[PDB]
Amino acid sequence: TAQQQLLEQVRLGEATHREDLVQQSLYRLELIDPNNPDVVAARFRSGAQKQLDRLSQGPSRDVKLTFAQIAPPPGSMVLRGINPNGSIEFGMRSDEVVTKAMLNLEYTPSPSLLPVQSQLKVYLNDELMGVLPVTKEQLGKKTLAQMPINPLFISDFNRVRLEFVGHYQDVCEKPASTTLWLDVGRSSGLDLTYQTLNVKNDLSHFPVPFFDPSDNRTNTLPMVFAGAPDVGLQQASAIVASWFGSRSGWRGQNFPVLYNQLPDRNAIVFATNDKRPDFLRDHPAVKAPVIEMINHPQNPYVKLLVVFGRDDKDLLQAAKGIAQGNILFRGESVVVNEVKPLLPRKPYDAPNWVRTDRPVTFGELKTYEEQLQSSGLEPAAINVSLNLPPDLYLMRSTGIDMDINYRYTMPPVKDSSRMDISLNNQFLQSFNLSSKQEANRLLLRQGLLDGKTDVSIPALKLGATNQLRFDFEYMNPMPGGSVDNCITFQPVQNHVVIGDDSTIDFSKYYHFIPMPDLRAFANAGFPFSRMADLSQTITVMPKAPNEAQMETLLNTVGFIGAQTGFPAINLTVTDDGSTIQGKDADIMIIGGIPDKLKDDKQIDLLVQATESWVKTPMRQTPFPGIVPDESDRAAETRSTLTSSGAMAAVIGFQSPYNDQRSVIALLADSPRGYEMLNDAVNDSGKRATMFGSVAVIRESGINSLRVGDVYYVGHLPWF
């Protein structure tokens, strides 16, 4: 049984005195079956009296994880004497257990390294589990190696570390030399199998059965309705999708929808008191909004979440309660009472976005403790990734001012070691590390130096996302002395630390951005992401939406709430285009166009049935400047073509009701085109290839362009 392996892991962890493994195993055995006396006794070992009180009272998946997918970008790894460690990380869900795991390697040792002495080691969260010595027959040839992985040592989050220690000379070998290396091919990878378990129908660990942060793959939980949902039900589903997208984050969001059809995976079921789904028939009527989880009628391995309410208002209340907290999930059939309204949100208050009104310390930008430090012969570059609003604008002034406090080891040379600051892989400035020792006396034979630096960056172009990089480049002397009698310096590991007191400020920027620019929409959700809860957005959805339109709306709202750090609890989904007249908000149109906005002549592309037309700009440049050129973006020709092919596009134009407000519409003509539009929307890689004002999505790919009038949104004072 799986619980037997869980208890074996439990006793293994206590034998190794590792609290992380045992705690995860307990969480798992309690998830699968918390009723047996064994789990309550094991929890007693891990207050203590309560455990004694209650004590007295499947399908499997085979996956391939090659180095080309879960390694640094190039995939291939080169291990040297300065960077001999290489890590590969993967995660296991809390509802699945790994039975068999195998590691396959394909490496080529350098021809010059000494045999036997040079060996390659593997570490699965430490726990040295084998060494691979280098023989004479494999000194300079490609080798195939296979080594099993013990399943009992695998936890929720774990990595495998490849340590390469090698030598090429007995005496006077040069460190950091290129003669020693060990290239690891990208074809190498792991080989493990996961097995699902029939977890208990308990809502206490919400939403682990439906979404667990341990899984690093895309979260694709579907949704099921009764068919042709009403306006309020669409709003509730959009709110739930936004909350789930915010919770998932960068994993990827995809919410397929079904109409009165059972799914084949964990899904959310929306069922009012009336028009109940066919499989939910004979469920007793409810008087209050209630949330419960029920097993799939066919197999118990699929867990379904059912949201029940008297009417669409109760469903909206339940969705708003789910988006917020204080629900206190426990057992099943948890009811949601009146939910307090959310407090008003200041613009640009997204939790993910870095604060702009006040200086931001490096401590809050740090995600894990070991991010702001490095060690080794050549310390690794410290990377600090910060998400920024996409409308930051600089108007002839000093840009990002940042104070840096750092600690570094004393360099061997006086005035050679430098610290390099790079933004978006662009060199910014260099600072020389001080030293108090001459090189001539280095052949003769304890503190840590401190440093303070003030840095100002022009930063004309920032973008939706960016990262920093601090490179500490030392000079390491080679062996010297006389030729007949040489002396080699023993390598010493040097540590570089960036203090948390370092602050970065963006208070000298302005919220100005040319429009229409859907690249910011693709990367940050602008302008709907200006309000974290989407309190200034109206969604125009077609009457009686089909599956494709519901899926497109769900995916768009999920990605918008994923780029933003907060769910959209105040989104307003409408059914007709007449109500948006005389309103001050950003209108997002899904699958179609209102007749009043379709003949305003600001539209640069309109796909209607088999006929579509586009306004070609005058001249398109691959790399535009900061200031848009109106002459270049002026329309030149309008060509209309008709064909049976499937196509979709996303366009943006100024709202005809307000100068500041903007309208972005997603349009499709055929179900295939809807499929391609969904795929482009939910895919992060494809969504980053769109810019300008019109972005067509054909089978070849996405070919965007910029055309039309330019309207500026924001506040810009005198100059």
Numbering used by the authors: 26 to 71, 80 to 90, 1068 to 1455, 1460 to 1733
The authors write:
Phosphoethanolamine (pEtN) cellulose is a naturally occurring modified cellulose produced by several Enterobacteriaceae. The minimal components of the E. coli cellulose synthase complex include the catalytically active BcsA enzyme, a hexameric semicircle of the periplasmic BcsB protein, and the outer membrane (OM)-integrated BcsC subunit containing periplasmic tetratricopeptide repeats (TPR). Additional subunits include BcsG, a membrane-anchored periplasmic pEtN transferase associated with BcsA, and BcsZ, a periplasmic cellulase of unknown biological function. Cellulose is a common bacterial biofilm component produced by a variety of prokaryotes, such as Escherichia coli (Ec), Salmonella enterica, and Gluconacetobacter/Komagataeibacter xylinus (Gx). These Gram-negative bacteria synthesize cellulose and secrete it across the cell envelope via the Bacterial cellulose synthase (Bcs) complex.
To improve the resolution of the BcsB-BcsC complex map, BcsC’s TPR#1–4 were fused to the N-terminus of BcsB, after its N-terminal signal sequence and separated by a linker. As also observed for the wild type Bcs complex, cryo-EM analysis identified a fully assembled Bcs complex together with (likely dissociated) partial subcomplexes containing three to five BcsB protomers. Although additional BcsC density similar to the one described above was also observed in a fully assembled complex, the highest quality map revealing the BcsB-BcsC interaction was obtained for a tetrameric BcsB assembly. TPR#1 mediates all interactions with BcsB and is best resolved. TPR#2 is rotated by about 45° relative to TPR#1 and extends away from BcsB. In complex with BcsB, TPR#1 is oriented with its interhelical loop pointing towards the center of the BcsB semicircle. It interacts extensively with one side of CBD-1’s jelly roll, as well as the region connecting the jelly roll with FD-1 (residues 208–220), Fig. 3b. In particular, TPR#1’s N-terminal helix (helix-1) rests on a short helical segment of a CBD-1 loop, such that its Gln30, Gln34, and Leu37 stack on top of BcsB’s Leu162, Phe163, and Ile164. The helix’s C-terminal end fits into a hydrophobic pocket formed by the CBD-1/FD-1 connection. Due to this arrangement, the observed BcsB-BcsC interaction is only possible with the last subunit of the BcsB hexamer.
